């Protein structure tokens, strides 16, 4: 039940699945696009103590990932490295094919010790962590990411 | 039909993609001679034309919940076939049966 | 046309699945606030209606060999595209004139 929006005459309109419209023209598979947008373009605070508050640990759910085509220039990026008080790593290693965000100016790298109760870190709002053309659900160690959401369109 | 309701919406869009580049001249297409991992991207810039960008942000914010619910009920580790599936059902609706 | 030939056939089917739930209310769809791995299943029960279940068992028992023969001739590790290919051929069969 994924919604998609169509664009016509510089107007964005959310088409209904139930209603079929003859005005829609799809003549190839290059007109389907997926775009990732940032949260900091909506006025959300970006300072470091004001963003570490929305990431919480849990155990009992497995992660899932999706893919990207386009992007957006960013101004702030994060790169985490957290260890248990005894010295154990709190975050998993990155899998194969995962790379950091390509185009962003500032990078806030943070290293410290915290109370890692769970196994995977999730967003308390329902948004995505953004990597190099792959949108994940958890946080991978030592990789630069952004915060954002995903949309699908017909050009 | 989409009206923005965020406190702010930046009306400037500054994006990066990869495109296809069609054909090439020289020895560029050979992976032995070509670029590195960073260097394959093409930039651009668009301007707010009747509030397209803010409506786009609203659309993403509305999509997130259904996207998460769909991701919950699958077995794969990486998903690549959402758009092909959308094409297949679009073709099945009109031209079938 | 399928006639059961097994010594016995159980005429009651008690089944489980996952579904999608469409919409949810509350904080249910957030992976931080949602259920665990076990708890996403919806159950049911069905009775024999003109030998549906026994014929179903016969159909699976007949399909097994062709399924194995198809599986032998691929290089993948996991297969998810049998139904999509079935749809593609079902569409390709009729649209030629």
């Amino acid at each position, epitope marked *: 039940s994924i919604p998609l929006g169509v664009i016509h005459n510089s107007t964005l309109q959310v088409s209904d699945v139930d209603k079929l419209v003859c005005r829609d023209k799809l003549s190839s598979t290059n007109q389907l696009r997926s775009v990732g947008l940032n949260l900091e373009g909506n006025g959300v605070a970006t300072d470091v103590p004001s963003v570490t508050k929305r990431w919480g640990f849990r155990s009992g759910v497995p992660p899932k990932v999706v893919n990207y085509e386009a992007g957006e220039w960013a101004e702030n990026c994060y790169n985490l490295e957290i260890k248990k008080p005894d010295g154990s790593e709190c975050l998993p290693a990155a899998p194969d094919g995962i790379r950091g965000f390509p185009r962003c100016r500032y990078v806030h790298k943070v290293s410290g010790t915290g109370p890692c109760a769970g196994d995977f870190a999730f967003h308390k709002e*329902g948004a995505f962590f953004l990597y190099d053309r792959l949108a994940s659900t958890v946080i991978y160690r030592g990789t630069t990411f952004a915060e954002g959401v995903v949309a699908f369109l017909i050009l | *039909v989409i009206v923005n*309701a965020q406190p702010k919406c930046n009306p400037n869009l500054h994006y990066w993609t990869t495109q296809d580049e069609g054909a090439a001249i020289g020895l560029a297409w050979i992976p032995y001679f070509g670029p590195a991992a960073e260097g394959i991207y093409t930039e651009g810039l668009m301007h707010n034309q009747d509030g397209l960008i803010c409506g786009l942000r609203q659309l993403a914010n*509305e999509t*997130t*919940q259904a996207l998460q619910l769909f991701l919950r009920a699958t077995t794969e580790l990486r998903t690549f076939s959402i758009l092909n599936r959308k094409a297949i059902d679009f073709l099945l609706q009109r031209w079938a049966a | 046309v399928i006639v059961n030939a097994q010594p016995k056939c159980n005429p009651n089917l008690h089944y489980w699945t996952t579904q999608d739930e469409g*919409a949810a*209310i509350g904080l249910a769809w957030i992976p931080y606030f949602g259920p665990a791995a076990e708890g996403i299943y919806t159950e049911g029960l069905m009775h024999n209606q003109d030998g549906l279940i026994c014929g179903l068992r016969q159909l699976a028992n007949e399909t097994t060999q062709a399924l194995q023969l198809f599986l032998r001739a691929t290089t993948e590790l996991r297969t998810f595209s049998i139904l999509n290919r079935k749809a593609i051929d079902f569409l390709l069969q009729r649209w030629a004139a």
Partner: antibody
Amino acid sequence: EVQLVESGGGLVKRGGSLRLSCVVSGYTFGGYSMHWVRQAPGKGLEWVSGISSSSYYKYYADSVKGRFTISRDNAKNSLYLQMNSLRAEDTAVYYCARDMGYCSGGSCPNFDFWGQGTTVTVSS
Amino acid sequence: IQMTQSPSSLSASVGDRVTITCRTSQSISNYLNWYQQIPGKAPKLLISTASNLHSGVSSRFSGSGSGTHFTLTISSLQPEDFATYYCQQSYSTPSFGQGTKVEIK
């Protein structure tokens, strides 16, 4: 100033049908989700149903599931409810309410604007 | 989820401080809201998220709590502060309270 006005309530016979409307004026209609609430002859409150901004998500209550229908229109800023197969327990006062959108589809309602409430009566 | 707010009726004189409690059968973090209703008028909003006052309301109202225990408090009665109160939660499907009435002596 935000103004919410309800209309359509009254008296109906047993097993009949009814329709209600809520009209909003004073701000942007299409950016927010709306909900219905109802109160009894003098007991507490109860929640009924709610809709989303793009008309993609709908919610219903167990006690009215399979009987009611909710809809909205952003063109004239209107909210509609249709109720069928009415019983004796549906004599009450109804309110249309607005909430702040802390959740993606309108699933975490924190009501902040109420109307004035109309009356529905059904008996012999 | 079911709620339990008590007492259901109180009577106090002008200049008193009134403290009410709302209780739940489940843990819902801090998704709680408070409401007030004059008899004959539609309800009006109060503090939200158990500690966040609305806009335009007096500073006499103050609420707090977490987990399963939440308390609302008013510091000075007024001739126009006799009404009905409610507590509501939104962690799961919404459910209201039963009501508590302030009276005069």
